[PDB]
C-alpha cells in the first residue's frame, strides 16, 4: 500500500532530522551562558546529536538565547533567513519570549516571535541548562510527529 510506505519514509526523515539537530552558534545575553552549560560535560548536548555550527547555512535550529534589541533585530532575521529549510527556532528565556525584565524599554523587541516564527518557548531567566535540554527534547518530539509525506500523499 502507498499509505504504509509514505508513513515509513516519513518516520525515516523525521528520525534523521531530530537525531542530527545542528544549532547555530548564536547567543545574545546571559541566557547563552546557560546554553554553554548544556554543552558542558554534565549535560553534553553533543551526545543527543546536537552539535553547534557557526555558519547559518549549516544550521538546522536557531536558539534565540538572550535579549533581542531593535538594533540586533535585522541581524537576527537575516541569519534566520539564511538558514536552509527545514529550520526550527527555539526561544530561550524571558527576554527572547516576551521581553522579560526589559519589556517596557525603548530599545527592546517584545518577543523574538515578532521577528521570526518560534517552535518551542523555554521559560526561565535563565532557564537552567536542564530546562533548555527539555526544550530541545520537546522539539525533537515535535519533529517526530510531522506528517510531511503523508500530507503530500493525499493532496
Amino acid at each position: 500500500r502507498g499509505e504504509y510506505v509514505v508513513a515509513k519514509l516519513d518516520d525515516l526523515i523525521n528520525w534523521a532530522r531530530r537525531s542530527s539537530l545542528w544549532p547555530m552558534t548564536f547567543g545574545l545575553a546571559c541566557c547563552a551562558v546557560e546554553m554553554m552549560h548544556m554543552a558542558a560535560p554534565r549535560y553534553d548536548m553533543d551526545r543527543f546529536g546536537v552539535v553547534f555550527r557557526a555558519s547559518p547555512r549549516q544550521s538546522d535550529v536557531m536558539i534565540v538565547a538572550g535579549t533581542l534589541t531593535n538594533k540586533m533585530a535585522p541581524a537576527l532575521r537575516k541569519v534566520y533567513d539564511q538558514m536552509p529549510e527545514p529550520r526550527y527556532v527555539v526561544s530561550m528565556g524571558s527576554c527572547a519570549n516576551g521581553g522579560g525584565y526589559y519589556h517596557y524599554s525603548y530599545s527592546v523587541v517584545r518577543g523574538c516571535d515578532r521577528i521570526v516564527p518560534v517552535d518551542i518557548y523555554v521559560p526561565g531567566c535563565p532557564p537552567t541548562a536542564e530546562a533548555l535540554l527539555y526544550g530541545i527534547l520537546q522539539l525533537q518530539k515535535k519533529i517526530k510527529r510531522e506528517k510531511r509525506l503523508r500530507i503530500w500523499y493525499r493532496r
Partner: protein, 115 residues
C-alpha cells in the same frame, strides 16, 4: 583502462551525489535566503575587491623552490650511476645553492610579511 575507469567512477559517484542533493530536497528560494553572508549585516562592498597579499615575496620564492623538487626528485635514480663522485658532488652543490637562496632571503628580511 583501469586507471581511467577508476577516475570515471570516483567523479561519477561525486557527481551523482551532488545531483541528488539538488533534486531530492524541498526548496523554498527567496531573495534574502541567497544573499551573501556577513554575520547578519549587509556586506560593505564587493567580495571581488582587491585583497592585498602580504606574503607576495614568499609566494614568488615558492615558484623558484618548487622547481628544485623537480631537479631533486631524480636523486634516487641518480645514485645508481657509476659516476658517484661526480653525482654526489653535484647533488650536494645543487642542494647547497638551494640553501644559500634561503639564507639570503631570510637574512634580507624577505620572509617577513609586509606590514
Amino acid at each position: 583502462m583501469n586507471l581511467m575507469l577508476a577516475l570515471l567512477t570516483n567523479f561519477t559517484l561525486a557527481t551523482l551525489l551532488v545531483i541528488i542533493a539538488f533534486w531530492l530536497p524541498q526548496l523554498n528560494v527567496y531573495s534574502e535566503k541567497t544573499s551573501p553572508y556577513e554575520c547578519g549585516f549587509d556586506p560593505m562592498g564587493s567580495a571581488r575587491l582587491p585583497f592585498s597579499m602580504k606574503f607576495f615575496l614568499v609566494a614568488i620564492t615558492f615558484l623558484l623552490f618548487d622547481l628544485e623538487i623537480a631537479l631533486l626528485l631524480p636523486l634516487p635514480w641518480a645514485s645508481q650511476t657509476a659516476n658517484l663522485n661526480t653525482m654526489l658532488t653535484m647533488a650536494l652543490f645543487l642542494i647547497i645553492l638551494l640553501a644559500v637562496s634561503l639564507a639570503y632571503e631570510w637574512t634580507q628580511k624577505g620572509l617577513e610579511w609586509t606590514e
